[PDB]
Design an enzyme around this catalytic site. Structure first.
Site, PDB file in Angstrom:
ATOM      1  N   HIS A  89     -11.735 -59.450   9.467  1.00 36.27           N
ATOM      2  CA  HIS A  89     -12.848 -60.329   9.053  1.00 36.27           C
ATOM      3  C   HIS A  89     -12.937 -61.514  10.006  1.00 36.27           C
ATOM      4  CE1 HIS A  89     -14.626 -63.673   6.866  1.00 36.27           C
ATOM      5  NE2 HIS A  89     -15.431 -62.741   6.405  1.00 36.27           N
ATOM      6  N   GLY A  90     -11.846 -62.269  10.160  1.00 39.13           N
ATOM      7  CA  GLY A  90     -11.758 -63.309  11.207  1.00 39.13           C
ATOM      8  C   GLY A  90     -11.938 -64.712  10.667  1.00 39.13           C
ATOM      9  N   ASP A  91     -12.290 -64.848   9.399  1.00 38.36           N
ATOM     10  CA  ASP A  91     -12.272 -66.170   8.708  1.00 38.36           C
ATOM     11  C   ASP A  91     -11.979 -65.902   7.238  1.00 38.36           C
ATOM     12  OD1 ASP A  91     -12.328 -68.926   8.158  1.00 38.36           O
ATOM     13  OD2 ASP A  91     -14.521 -68.961   8.021  1.00 38.36           O
ATOM     14  N   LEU A  92     -10.896 -65.188   6.969  1.00 36.62           N
ATOM     15  CA  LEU A  92     -10.535 -64.812   5.595  1.00 36.62           C
ATOM     16  C   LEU A  92      -9.868 -66.040   4.942  1.00 36.62           C
ATOM     17  CD1 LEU A  92     -11.136 -62.151   4.141  1.00 36.62           C
ATOM     18  CD2 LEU A  92      -8.733 -61.551   4.391  1.00 36.62           C
TER      19      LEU A  92
END
Ligand SMILES: Nc1ncnc2c1ncn2[C@@H]1O[C@H](COP(=O)(O)OP(=O)(O)OP(=O)(O)O)[C@@H](O)[C@H]1O
Length: 282
Positions: free
Chosen positions: A183-186
């Site tokens: 996701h990269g901004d969980l």
């Protein structure tokens, strides 16, 4: 422009309560945030190229079957409005506050909500994903280190620079992993929860913009930064991901610098400031 867009909306979709409706006219797109629906109206015919990209990423993520909601295109991308528009489902829920997530009666449930989404992301068919999403590139962290040196080093104490070189190097040291969805901004504000019969349920994840084929460790690092070591230890133990700790720590060591470098490159003073706080003196 925005009373044009509103008629366009009422034109395309009669019933759309626009009082209460939020509005973000950020850099590239105007977003109308209505009841059950979001409308994205790009500014420039260049930025309109993003709409089928967002459809393609949300469709690819939807197909993985995470067991939580992701925004659904409710409309085709349309060539209506100044440069086109996309309507998406609104997801309901609230980010989970650190304090809400660590109470002893909820922490096991919270851990398992993160674990079941992380597990399904790690088990995605990456051959299918690699056709649509960005893919982790072996050169990413060298790249980031260059821009940290260019942009933030001159603003740091000498001790700041030495700390940053160690954190940058731990990231550059990691070998290349591209085996699941990231996701990269969980554990941001874009991960949504609801009380379901008096216990947390992770019901939705918005903001798949930074998503890629990558390293399962990267999302675990972010859960740790947002919720503390007790929670990420439980998620890791459930996942059987004890071997990831050095990768997890390498990601986490770069987060203050990521903040600072994006503050500058974008133009937020409070971000740029707050990242660097540990790389200067009081
Ligand atoms: N389908 C959706 N369901 C729920 N909330 C949504 C949905 N689409 C947008 N939002 C909300 O409205 C905002 C619209 O802004 P946008 O999606 O461009 O994100 P941003 O915060 O500007 O970007 P980023 O977080 O990637 O830096 C989002 O931050 C999110 O909170």
């Amino acid at each position: 422009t925005l009373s044009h867009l509103v008629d366009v909306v009422r034109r395309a979709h009669p019933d759309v309560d626009l009082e209460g409706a939020g509005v973000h006219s950020g850099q590239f797109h105007d977003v109308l945030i209505a009841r059950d629906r979001v409308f994205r109206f790009p500014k420039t015919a260049g930025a309109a190229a993003e709409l089928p990209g967002r459809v393609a990423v949300l469709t690819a993520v939807d197909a993985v079957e995470l067991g939580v909601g992701v925004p659904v295109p409710l409309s085709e991308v349309r060539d209506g409005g100044p440069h086109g528009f996309l309507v998406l489902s609104r997801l309901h829920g609230t980010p989970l506050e650190r304090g809400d997530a660590t109470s002893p009666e909820v922490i096991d449930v919270v851990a398992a909500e993160f674990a079941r989404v992380l597990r399904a992301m790690a088990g995605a068919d990456v051959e299918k994903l690699r056709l649509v999403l960005p893919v982790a590139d072996a050169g990413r962290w060298r790249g980031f280190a260059g821009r940290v040196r260019a942009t933030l080093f001159p603003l740091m104490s000498e001790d700041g620079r030495a700390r940053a070189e160690r954190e940058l190097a731990a990231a550059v040291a990691m070998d290349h992993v591209a085996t699941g969805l990231v996701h990269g901004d969980l554990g941001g504000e874009n991960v949504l929860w609801q009380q379901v019969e008096e216990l947390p349920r992770l019901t939705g994840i918005v903001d798949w913009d930074e998503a890629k084929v990558g390293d399962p460790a990267e999302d675990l690092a972010a859960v740790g930064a947002s919720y503390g070591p007790e929670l990420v230890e439980r998620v890791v133990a459930l996942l059987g991901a004890g071997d990831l700790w050095p990768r997890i720590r390498a990601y986490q060591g770069t987060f203050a610098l990521q903040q600072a470098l994006a503050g500058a490159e974008d133009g937020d003073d409070e971000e740029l400031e707050d990242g660097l706080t540990a790389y200067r003196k009081l």
